[PDB]
Amino acid sequence: KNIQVVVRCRPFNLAERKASAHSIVECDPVRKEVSVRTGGLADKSSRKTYTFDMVFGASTKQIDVYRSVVCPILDEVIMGYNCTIFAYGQTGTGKTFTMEGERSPNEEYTWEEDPLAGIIPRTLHQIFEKLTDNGTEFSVKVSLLEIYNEELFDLLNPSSDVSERLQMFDDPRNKRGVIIKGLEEITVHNKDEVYQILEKGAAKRTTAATLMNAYSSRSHSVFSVTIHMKETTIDGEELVKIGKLNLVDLAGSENININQSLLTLGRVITALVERTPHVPYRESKLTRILQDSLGGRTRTSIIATISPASLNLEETLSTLEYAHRAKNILNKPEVN
């Protein structure tokens, strides 16, 4: 039942080293604990310690995250589940790095072989391996929207202006899901179509950041992957199983209509752990989209990102307290 929650702590950055930052985070992958040093100069012994499903310290690499977190989820997508992974944390702590990753400088690497590639690129590659050897005819379609100030933007649309808005409506073929009217879904025929599609999306995203104040930290980003697989049974009946993967990069947790989605996510989580009736899904775009992933038939994970520095203490505790709280959400996962 319960949603899986894991924590990643990023290494120091150069500004932090320049400022003589001290660490206040200790990860123990084996005991699965994060432990925060909380007493500054006054109490050297003080700590807060939390247990998670998995933990990744400052030295963890993108391959590691992928191997430990995603391969398991990928398999269940391939058996025809819906899964969602998403990233939660204060701006600057590695949500985008974790979910998308970055390109290594000077085209030193092919995109499939980049050690900085995040979950999204690695996953699309992986989907073509696991599935070609297998034969089993399959199609893959991707989508990429952003929520900003409760407006919806389509990063993969042929339309040349990012500012053109999507709309959502209740799926009548699913009591817990939404249809995004206007959303471009692109068929991806081989692993060699991938980079160009991404690159398009990245450029459309660069423009948007210049149109909208604080775009990169105030927006939520929803990448989806849909898979259709043909299976003939032992009888010879030809049945098609469908699996979906949503990859969410949330707005910075530090914020808190500009904030409606982050707020309502908070409340939705609360109403679930405190077994309240009438969870407020309807009250935001994000939560209408994520509704099946919090409480519903989708299998969900959450990556809490944090910074190791003494300066970010209050936000770091904040992220851990909120993440740990979410371990108490139980979904009823089910195939399609």
Ligand X SMILES: Nc1ncnc2c1ncn2[C@@H]1O[C@H](COP(=O)(O)OP(=O)(O)O)[C@@H](O)[C@H]1O
Nearer to ligand X by Cβ, of 11 and 39: the residue is: 11
Q: Does 218 bind ligand X (CB under 6 A)?
A: no
Q: Mark the segment that binds Mg ion (CB under 5 A) among 92-100, 113-121, 192-200, 271-279.
A: 92-100
Residue 303 backbone phi and psi in degrees, to 5: -105, 110
CB of 84 to ligand DQ6, least distance (A): 16
Q: Any binding-site annotation on 291?
A: no
CB of 65 to ligand X, least distance (A): 8
Q: Please enumerate, as own/partner, the contacts of 185-191 that have beta carbons within 8 Å and a separation of 24 or more.
A: 185/141, 185/142, 185/143, 185/226, 186/141, 186/142, 186/143, 186/156, 187/139, 187/140, 187/141, 188/124, 188/140, 188/141, 188/142, 190/128, 191/112, 191/124, 191/125, 191/128
Reading the block at residue 139, the tokens are 């199609």
Q: Mark the segment that binds Mg ion (CB under 5 A) among 88-96, 187-195, 282-290, 301-309.
A: 88-96
Judged by CB under 5 A, the chain residues 93 through 122 that form the site for Mg ion are 96
CB of 253 to ligand X, least distance (A): 9
Q: Which helix (H) or strand (E) holds 181?
A: strand 178-181
Nearer to ligand DQ6 by Cβ, of 120 and 309: the residue is: 120
Q: Which of 228, 243, 289, 294 is nearest to 74 (CA)?
A: 243
CB of 253 to ligand DQ6, least distance (A): 18
Do residues 110 and 98 lie in contact, with contact meaning Cβ atoms separated by under 8 Å? no
Residue 23, exposed/middle/buried by CB under 10 A (0-12, 13-18, 19+)?
middle
Q: Does 97 bind ligand X (CB under 6 A)?
A: yes
> What residue has token string 């959450």?
302
Q: Mark the segment that binds ligand X (CB under 6 A) among 94-102, 148-156, 231-239, 266-274.
A: 94-102
Per-residue DSSP letters for 154-168?
Answer: ETT-SSS-TTPBPEE
Q: Does 57 bind ligand X (CB under 6 A)?
A: no
CB of 325 to Mg ion, least distance (A): 23
Q: Any binding-site annotation on 95?
A: yes
Contact letters (x/-) for ligand DQ6, 102-131, by CB under 6 A?
xx-------x--x-xxx-xx----------
Q: Which of 94, 121, 243, 296 binds ligand X (CB under 6 A)?
A: 94
Burial 61-77 (b: 16+ CB within 10 A, else e): ebeebbeebbeebbebb
Q: Which residues bind ligand X (CB under 6 A)?
A: 10-11, 13, 89, 91-97, 102, 305
Q: Which residues bind ligand DQ6 (CB under 6 A)?
A: 96, 100-103, 111, 114, 116-118, 120-121, 195, 198-199, 201-202, 205
Pick out the residues of the known binding site for ATP. Answer: 89-96
